[PDB]
Design an enzyme around this catalytic site. Structure first.
Site, PDB file in Angstrom:
ATOM      1  N   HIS B  96       0.828  -1.206   0.000  1.00 17.30           N
ATOM      2  CA  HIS B  96       0.000   0.000   0.000  1.00 17.30           C
ATOM      3  C   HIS B  96       0.860   1.252   0.000  1.00 17.30           C
ATOM      4  O   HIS B  96       2.031   1.244   0.395  1.00 17.30           O
ATOM      5  CB  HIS B  96      -0.924   0.056   1.222  1.00 17.30           C
ATOM      6  CG  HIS B  96      -0.173   0.159   2.510  1.00 17.30           C
ATOM      7  ND1 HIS B  96       0.547  -0.894   3.029  1.00 17.30           N
ATOM      8  CD2 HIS B  96       0.012   1.201   3.358  1.00 17.30           C
ATOM      9  CE1 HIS B  96       1.133  -0.514   4.153  1.00 17.30           C
ATOM     10  NE2 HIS B  96       0.818   0.753   4.382  1.00 17.30           N
ATOM     11  N   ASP B  98       0.574   5.021   1.738  1.00 14.76           N
ATOM     12  CA  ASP B  98      -0.155   5.440   2.938  1.00 14.76           C
ATOM     13  C   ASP B  98      -1.241   6.468   2.639  1.00 14.76           C
ATOM     14  O   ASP B  98      -1.001   7.468   1.963  1.00 14.76           O
ATOM     15  CB  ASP B  98       0.808   6.009   3.961  1.00 14.76           C
ATOM     16  CG  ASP B  98       1.593   4.928   4.670  1.00 14.76           C
ATOM     17  OD1 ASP B  98       1.089   3.769   4.770  1.00 14.76           O
ATOM     18  OD2 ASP B  98       2.706   5.251   5.121  1.00 14.76           O
ATOM     19  N   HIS B 230       4.569   0.175   0.145  1.00 13.64           N
ATOM     20  CA  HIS B 230       5.363  -0.625   1.069  1.00 13.64           C
ATOM     21  C   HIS B 230       4.512  -1.733   1.674  1.00 13.64           C
ATOM     22  O   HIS B 230       3.283  -1.768   1.546  1.00 13.64           O
ATOM     23  CB  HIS B 230       6.008   0.231   2.169  1.00 13.64           C
ATOM     24  CG  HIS B 230       5.014   1.025   2.962  1.00 13.64           C
ATOM     25  ND1 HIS B 230       4.528   2.239   2.526  1.00 13.64           N
ATOM     26  CD2 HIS B 230       4.395   0.771   4.139  1.00 13.64           C
ATOM     27  CE1 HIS B 230       3.648   2.698   3.398  1.00 13.64           C
ATOM     28  NE2 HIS B 230       3.544   1.825   4.383  1.00 13.64           N
ATOM     29  N   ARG B 247       6.425   6.683  14.190  1.00  9.35           N
ATOM     30  CA  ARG B 247       6.343   7.210  12.840  1.00  9.35           C
ATOM     31  C   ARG B 247       5.916   8.668  12.892  1.00  9.35           C
ATOM     32  O   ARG B 247       5.068   9.044  13.703  1.00  9.35           O
ATOM     33  CB  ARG B 247       5.335   6.422  11.964  1.00  9.35           C
ATOM     34  CG  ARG B 247       5.268   6.973  10.523  1.00  9.35           C
ATOM     35  CD  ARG B 247       4.398   6.199   9.541  1.00  9.35           C
ATOM     36  NE  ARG B 247       3.297   5.446  10.130  1.00  9.35           N
ATOM     37  CZ  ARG B 247       2.099   5.943  10.428  1.00  9.35           C
ATOM     38  NH1 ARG B 247       1.826   7.227  10.237  1.00  9.35           N
ATOM     39  NH2 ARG B 247       1.170   5.153  10.948  1.00  9.35           N
TER      40      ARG B 247
HETATM   41 MG   LIG Z   1       1.815   1.888   5.537  1.00  5.64          MG
END
Ligand SMILES: [Mg+2]
Ligand SMILES: [Mg+2]
Lengths: 271, 280
Positions: B96, B98, B230, B247
């Site tokens: 996917h 993000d 990713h 993150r």
């Molecule tokens: Mg992701």
């Protein structure tokens, strides 16, 4: 434990440290490497700069070396840098499974290694079998597959190979060489093979290795398939490795039936 | 060049050395990291042991950090920092880009490893600019003209994006096919959409378009969401090891296709978008 074992993923691959492959290994070192190999399916060494002679001697401590030629060393095959229908399983294979007795292991060492590009991948086919659902396991347990290679070798192997040292069942689906499932219709065979090949190459079953000069990969062909790189053709970097393989036994299925030769050196030098 | 750039595959991934992310980067270091990011799509650092404050400060030198969800990944005192701590399986499952269900997906994310297992938990990225270029010419011309609907339902966001995104810094065409979130191709029949998406998703996840990263404590991954998808690990579910990462992500612009048309919002809410930022 004199040899450090560093696993590289949940279920496949381990880097080994604390052994000098340029000299004869003692029995404890051989046993440790063999145990790590059975547990992790492919083991890797770093900074082992070997001659062909030393590569053969190392190989001979684990089995009988099979006989791209290397002068003076018929056991050693040169892997040198010097259109396709692409599916997720393309290029994945187990070495020389078109033969009646595929080599049980290969040892590949990196001599001229690009700064980047040219990684190799392996997949764990014991885990792939275990991760089939129970009805699919019982189903493939009874199936046979025809493996073919044309430079001509044709062999019928069990779809599920019982590992001769661990007793584990392996989903023996060598995607480059397995052509059909015996006894089912052509479409049934095609659809089932695509299902099993998709399954056998799940990322969580795999490990990837970035080569460096002096690296060595030693894998159990009875429980893995592997994937040679194609990204390296996009780069100017030379790439040169050398391979030995160890003579294997005839596979057997869960019913005890040995593989059967149908028709049939060139696949030992290429696959 | 003060920052050493070590590529990790033919077309994606590079490890950077020679920079201390605990202190503010000078303009030359920022520029070098930015250039390596555009060229290699995802860049990695090792042995960078950061506090949340330092992680945010580093992020802010490259863009505007997104500002969090009330619950999902929430870290008290740090709205920029997201805590990261039966299925039908196809080769593209889990791949996917993000938050592509939103109108303006984040252009980058910065993921740092604090508590990292000895093994298991690798992440993979694929190069979607290369994926586009490796389509044949007739397929490239075809997808240039197509739009896709991306959807996400938090524990509803719906956006129409170009199938081919024109990268706002490099001008490269990107095969913007975010497999977890792209649901349909606009204007074709449901079976045409299904078959074409499976073709493009299989293509976008070719192994030769990918790089894999084994985390260690203090590692950092910094990737360009405009040019990549990713794959988060699943091999960790079988292991008893703790795994803690954090993150940040950087606010992105609205995508544009080769015809210059911006993406178009269909449904959504600010809180649903923040949930996708936190969870994708
Ligand atoms: Mg992701
Ligand atoms: Mg091979």
């Amino acid at each position: 434990p004199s040899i450090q074992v560093k696993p590289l993923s949940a279920h496949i691959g381990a880097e080994l440290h604390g052994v000098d492959l340029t000299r004869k290994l003692d029995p404890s070192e051989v046993a440790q490497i063999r145990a790590a190999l059975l547990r992790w399916r492919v083991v890797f060494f770093r900074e082992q700069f070997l001659t062909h002679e030393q590569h053969v001697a190392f190989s001979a401590q684990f089995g009988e070396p099979t006989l791209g030629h290397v002068d003076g060393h018929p056991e050693v095959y040169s892997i040198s840098k010097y259109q396709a229908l692409l599916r997720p399983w393309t290029g994945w294979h187990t070495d020389v499974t078109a033969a009646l007795n595929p080599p049980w292991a290969s040892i590949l060492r990196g001599v001229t290694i690009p700064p980047y590009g040219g990684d190799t991948q392996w997949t764990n086919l014991a885990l792939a079998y275990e991760k089939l659902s129970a009805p699919l396991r019982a189903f493939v347990d009874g199936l046979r597959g025809v493996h073919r290679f044309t430079p001509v070798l044709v062999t019928e192997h069990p779809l599920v190979r019982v590992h001769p040292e661990t007793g584990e069942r392996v989903l023996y689906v060598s995607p480059s060489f397995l052509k059909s499932i015996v006894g089912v219709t052509p479409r049934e065979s095609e659809a089932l093979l695509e299902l099993l090949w998709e399954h056998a190459t799940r990322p969580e079953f795999t490990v990837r290795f970035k080569w460096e000069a002096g690296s060595v990969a030693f894998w159990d062909n009875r429980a893995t398939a592997h994937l040679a790189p194609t990204d390296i053709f996009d780069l100017d970097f030379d790439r040169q490795l050398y391979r030995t393989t160890l003579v294997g036994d005839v596979p057997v299925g869960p019913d005890g039936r040995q593989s059967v030769a149908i028709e049939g050196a060139a696949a030992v030098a290429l696959n």
